[PDB]
Amino acid sequence: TYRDAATALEHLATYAEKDGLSVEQLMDRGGLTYNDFLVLPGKIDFPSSEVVLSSRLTKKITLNAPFVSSPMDTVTEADMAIHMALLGGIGIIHHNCTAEEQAEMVRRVKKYENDGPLASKSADTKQLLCGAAIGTIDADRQRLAMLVEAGLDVVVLDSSQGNSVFQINMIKWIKETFPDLQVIAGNVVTREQAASLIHAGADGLRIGMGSGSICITQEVMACGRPQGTAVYNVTQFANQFGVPCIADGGVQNIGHITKAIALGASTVMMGGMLAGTTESPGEYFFRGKRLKTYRGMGSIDAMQKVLVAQGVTGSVIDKGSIKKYIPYLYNGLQHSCQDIGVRSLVEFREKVDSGSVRFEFRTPSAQLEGGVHNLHSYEKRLFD
Amino acid sequence: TYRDAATALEHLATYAEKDGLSVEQLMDRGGLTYNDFLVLPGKIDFPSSEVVLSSRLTKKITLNAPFVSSPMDTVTEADMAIHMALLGGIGIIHHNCTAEEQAEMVRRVKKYENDGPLASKSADTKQLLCGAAIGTIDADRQRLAMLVEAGLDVVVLDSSQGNSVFQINMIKWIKETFPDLQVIAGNVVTREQAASLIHAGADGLRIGMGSGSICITQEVMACGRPQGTAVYNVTQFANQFGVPCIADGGVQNIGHITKAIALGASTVMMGGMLAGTTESPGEYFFRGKRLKTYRGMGSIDAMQKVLVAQGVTGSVIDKGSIKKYIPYLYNGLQHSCQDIGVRSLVEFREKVDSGSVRFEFRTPSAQLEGGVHNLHSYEKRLFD
Amino acid sequence: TYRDAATALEHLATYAEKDGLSVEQLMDRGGLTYNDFLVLPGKIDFPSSEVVLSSRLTKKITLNAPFVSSPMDTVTEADMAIHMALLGGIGIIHHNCTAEEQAEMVRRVKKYENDGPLASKSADTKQLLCGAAIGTIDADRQRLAMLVEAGLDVVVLDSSQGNSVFQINMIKWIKETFPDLQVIAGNVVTREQAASLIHAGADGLRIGMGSGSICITQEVMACGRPQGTAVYNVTQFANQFGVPCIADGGVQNIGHITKAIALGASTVMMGGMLAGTTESPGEYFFRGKRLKTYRGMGSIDAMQKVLVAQGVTGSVIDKGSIKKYIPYLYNGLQHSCQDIGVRSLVEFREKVDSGSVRFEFRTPSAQLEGGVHNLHSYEKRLFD
C-alpha cells in the first residue's frame, strides 16, 4: 500500500537528518575547493528582488554588494575603484607605482562627483569609499601617510604570506598612528595565521594562497591551500572575533561567489573576472580577438616595472563594462540565494551554520554532467 | 586439493553477501552520477524480446516505454509529440509560444489519425496522449484552460526549482479546477522538495537540476545535484507515496536510461538525445556536418524569443528520425534488462530494492577502460 | 643516536606488516582496474632468463606462455593460430564465417608442419594446439562436430554474457558428447556467473565485460565490470575449483599482463594488441600511416558480414610480426617477474596469495608521473 500524500511533510521527521550534508559534514574528501561541491536548493517563497546582499568588508565598513576588485596593476586604478563603489562594492588601488601616483589615484576616487542608492559612500562626507594596498616595509609608512591624506578609507596589507613580523609590526603601527583607518591583513589560509593577524589588530582578513588564475605560488613554493578549504577553516575561527574575511582568488563565476560566502566569506575579491573590462587599466589589443593583458603581481613583468616569479603574464578577452558585469553578478547572486531559499547574505550565513542549508559533493563525472556537455558546438552567452 | 564442481552453487552460500554492492551500499563516494557505476550482469533465462518496458508516467498514466521528450523549443512540438506517442512514450509540448499557439499544437496531437499496439492512447477515445508544460504565474491559469479544452492529458509545471509557493499554489488550483488532469511537478532534487510537492497534490515529479547537456545552472547558481544521487534520494521518498518520477537531464545513451531506472526513476526525459531528429522543431543547417540548433530554455536566445542565462545555445548533429531512434532505445533497453536478468521494469525495481541486482563503482581508469580506447581511429555507429 | 646498519634486517620485524598492501587490502577504492595500482619490487637473486611462464589454459591444457589471441575476425584465423602456438601460446579461431570455413581453418592449424621447444603441441600427435569459438544455439552443435572432426583441442563458448541457460545447456551437451574436448565458458565478471558455469562443467572461464578496446557494452547496456576487479573476484572463487581463467579485454602492455596474473588470472587474451600484426587477417591500408581494421564482433560491420551495436569499427597501426611481438611480451614478462622477485607464474600466484607480494594504489597524479611526462616530444619505441 502507498502512503497518503497528506502525510508527506510529516514523514520527513522519520529521517535522522535532512537530505544532503551540513557544511561540517562537507568540510571534514579533504583538500576541496569550490568546484568539488554544490549547494542544494531549498524552498522559494519570495522573489529574487527581495534578496539583500549587504556584506561586511571590515569591522566598521559594510557594503551593499560583496564585490571587491583586486589590487593589481591590470585590474584596479581610479576608474575601477570609482565604478566599483558606484555599483555597491569597492576597489583596492594597487601599489605598483610611486606613492605620489597612488595618492593621486585615491584622491581621484575621493573627489568624484556624478548616483544609485546602493553606492558605497562614507556616512559623513558621502564621498565614494576607496581602498588601497601597501607593502609592509618601512618606506610604506610614508606611502600610507600620503594615502591617508588623500582620504583613504581602508588599507590592504599586500602579501602572499601575511603572517610575518613585518606585517604584524605594520598593523600595530597603523592602529596606533591612524586609529580611524580600517586595516585588512593577509593573505592567510590557516587558522594560526588568522589568529596572529587578528591578535595584531586586523579589522579584516584576506584569504587565499595560490588560487589566483595567474598565480603559480603552489607550484614554485609548494605552499598554499585549496581555496574552499582555506575559506572554511579561516572563517570558522575569524568569524568568532567578528573579523570579516575576503575570499580572494579562484573566483570565475557567480557560483564561486555563492560558495565562498556559504563557506564563511563575507566578501569576494576578483582579479581575472574584472581584468579585460573597460574600467580596468591597460589598453585593448587584438589577436582575431580583442584582449587585455592580465598579469600576476609576482610575474617578472610586474616586478620589473635572480628573481623568482610567483605569477605569470597572460591575456584575457574583452568583457565589456563593469556597468553591465557587476549588475549581472548582483542579480545572479540574488537568484542563487532565491534557489537556496535565503533572503539575505546574513540569513545565508545563519542557515549554513545551523545546518539548514545542505550541500553535496560532486565526483568528476558529476562535474562534467554539471557543465555543458555533448554538444557539437555552443556559445556561452552569460547575460544580455 | 580442489573443490568438486558439483558443489559450486552450494559454495556461494559460504559468502556473507552477493558479489558487488547493493544499491544502498552504492548510494551511501558521495555525489555520484550515472557514469560513476555499473550494474553487474545476472542470469539469462529468457529472450530479450520477452522484456516488458511498461512504465508509470504519473499516478494514473502508464506508458509502454519509459521515454519522455523534453518541453523545449528545439525538442518538442506537435510532430515530436505525435511520434513519441505512436512509439509508446509521450511528448511534453513546450510553452515558449503564445497560449493559442500551444493549444493548437496540443489539438494537432489529439486529432491525429493514421498504429502499433504499443501506441500511447487514451483508454476512452483512443486518441494519442499529449503532455504540455506551463509556468506557474497567474496568466498560466488561462493558458492551462485553453490546453485542457484542446484535450491535454498531462501538464508539467516547468521550473528549474519547483519547490516554490507559486508552484504549490498552482498544483492546488489545478487539482481543484481540473480534477481529471494529471500534474507533474518539479524540477526537484531533494527529499524535502519532493515532500512539499507531493503534499500539494502532484501526480508525478520531474527530477533534475543542472544535469542538462545545455544547462549551466550549477555554474551560475551553485545550486543543483548530481543526477544519479538526485534520482536515488528523491525516489526513495516519492516511491513510498506511489508518485512516479521522471529522471530529467544528463541522459545520453541507453545505459543512462537503465541506470536512471535502477536508481528509482519510472521514466526518463530527453532533450539533447532527441534534438537533431527529423521530428524536432527547427530546420537543419550545414557546417561539413548537418546540424540543428539545440538550446537551453534559460539561454538568452530562448528567453528573448540584466538577464542571467542558465543555459546555452548550441548545435547537435543530425540524428535521423525517431522512427528508428526510439526503437533502438527500446530494443537496447530490452537487451540491457536481459543482461541484468530481469524481464520487466517492474521486476527491475523489485530486484534492485531487494538487493538481488548488484552494482559496482568505476574509478576514472575503469571509465576509460569501459569506453573505446587505444585505437588510431574509429566510427561509433550505434545501430543499423 | 642512529641505529647500527648491522641491525637493519632485524629491525623490519618491529613493523606490524610488510610495506605496501596485500592483494586483499588492495581489492577491498572499489571498482579498480589495472592502471589504478602497481606491484612493488622484491628481491632479485636470479636472472630473468630463469623465469618460467607456464600457464594453465584449462583443467587439462597447459601452455608455455600465458598468451591467447582473441576469437575476432580481425585478430585470429589460421595464420595467427599457427604462429601463436609455435610461440608457446594459443589462438582461438573466430566463428564469423561458415562452419565449413571455420573447420578448414582449424584443419590448417592441425596439419601444419615446419620448431622451438616451447611450441604448444598435443602430447600424443605433436600437432599444434588449436582453439575455436562457437555460439550456443542449436546450429552450433553441428558446427562443433565439424570442428572436432578437424582436430579441435579447445572450444570457447563466445558470449558477452555467458551466464545463460543456452550456454549452460551447451556446456552439458559438449561434456556428454565430446568428453575429451576442453570447454572454456563465458564471458563472466561475477562470482555467481562463475559458479553457474563451473557447476555446468566448464574447464576454464573467460573473464571480462566491457573492457575491450573496441567494446561499448558498458555504455549501451550499463552492464559490465572493471577488469581488475572482475579478475580478482571471479578467480578468488574459480581458483578454488581448479578452473583456470582467461583475463580477456583491456590489456595493452606487459604491465597489464603482470597485473592480470597477480589478480588471479591464469592466461590473458588479447585482441587489440594483436590486431595490426602481420599474422592477423585483413589487409593493410594507408592513411600517412599503415593501418589495419580492428572491429568489435558486436559492431554493425561484423554483425552484417534494429541492430543494437555493442562494439565499434576502427583502425590500429601496423605492429609488425608476432614473431617479434610475442617474444617481446615473453621477455618483458620475465623481467617483470624478476623485478617482483618471483621465478615462475606459479610462484607469483603463491606469493600474492600469501601476502608476500605487495601492491600500491596510484592516484591520478601518480599515474601521470608513472607515464611519460614533461617532454617537448618523444618516440615510444618498445623493443628493437
Next chain:
Amino acid sequence: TYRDAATALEHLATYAEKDGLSVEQLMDRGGLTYNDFLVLPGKIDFPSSEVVLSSRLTKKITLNAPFVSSPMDTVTEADMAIHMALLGGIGIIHHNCTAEEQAEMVRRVKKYENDGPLASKSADTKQLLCGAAIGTIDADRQRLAMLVEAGLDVVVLDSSQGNSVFQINMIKWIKETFPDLQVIAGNVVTREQAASLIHAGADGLRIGMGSGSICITQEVMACGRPQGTAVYNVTQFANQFGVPCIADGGVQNIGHITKAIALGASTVMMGGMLAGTTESPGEYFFRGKRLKTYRGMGSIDAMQKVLVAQGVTGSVIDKGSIKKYIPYLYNGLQHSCQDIGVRSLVEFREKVDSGSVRFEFRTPSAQLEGGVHNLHSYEKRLFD
C-alpha cells in the same frame, strides 16, 4: 557577542590539533605523489636569505645545496659535474661509455681550477667533488678501480631495481676494497629494499622507480611506486640509520624539491630539469624551437649506443645555463622555506617530524585551481 582580539592566540589552544594534517596523517588517500598535496604556510620572522640549504648526500658527504644531476648520457658529463659542484651540489657522471672515457671525465672534474664559498669541494685537497655511476657486474670492478684512481668521491650503483644479490655483493666488495669511497645504492622504493641495501653497507640510497619523465618501467613492468609515497616510506626507515636518501625522478619544479625534502629526502636528483641546459651533453638542434635530446638510459637508443625498452627518447626545450638555473632553484627553495617558516633544511626535517609543519591534500579541482587557469593565453617565465 564576539571574542576579544586580544584572546585570539590563546583561543588556538581550544582546538584538538593544529590546522591541516601532520605528515603521518597525510601519508596514511594511498598512492600519493607530490602534486597530490601542499605544505601549509607558517610564521615568517626572518628573511629568505637566512635560509641554509645544507644537505647530506651520504653518511660522510654534505653539500651546500640539495641538488644532484642524474647519471644519464644526456644530462651529466664533466661540464655538468664541474658546474654543479661550483654551485653547491654535485654531478653523477654516467657510465654509457668505456671505463677509460668515464675515468677521463672524472679526472677533468677533479683537476678543474678556476670560486664561490658554497662550492662542493673536498676538505683536504679543495678539489671539486665528483660522483659517478657504475653497474654491478664483474667488469664494473675494474671500471671502479679506474674511477677511484681518477679521484672519484662517491659511486652510485645504477639500477632500476637495486635490491639484488649482484648489487649487495658489489656494495660489500667496495666497502672492503675502497673503504674511503662513499657508496650510494639503489634504486629502491620499499622499506624492505632499503633494509637490504643498508645492511650491505650503503652510505646513501637512491629512491625512485618509474617516476622519471622519460621512464616507462611502471607501464612495461607493472612495478614501481608513486614517488612521494616511496620517499616517505623509505626514508622513515633509512633516516633511523642515518642513511641519507636521494629523491630521484619526477621532479619538475621548486615545489617538488620542497615536497621531496618534507617527505624525508636529504637531496633531490634531476634529469629532465637539467637536460637541455648549456652544460648538459649533446648538441642543440631546431624544430621553430631550440631543443636537445633527452632519453632514458633504458631507451633502445641508449642501450644500442629482443631488447625490452624501459625508457623513451625525446626532446626538451633549451633551458639556458645552469649558472642561472641552479641559483633560481636555490633562491626559490629559500623562499619556500621562508613561507613555511623554517630557517634550514635540518629545521624543516625536525619540524615536519614533530608535527609543527602541516599539510593539505589537493583534489583534482584544487590542483587545477592551483595551476594557471582561465586565461586566453599566457607566458610562464620562471625567473629573470
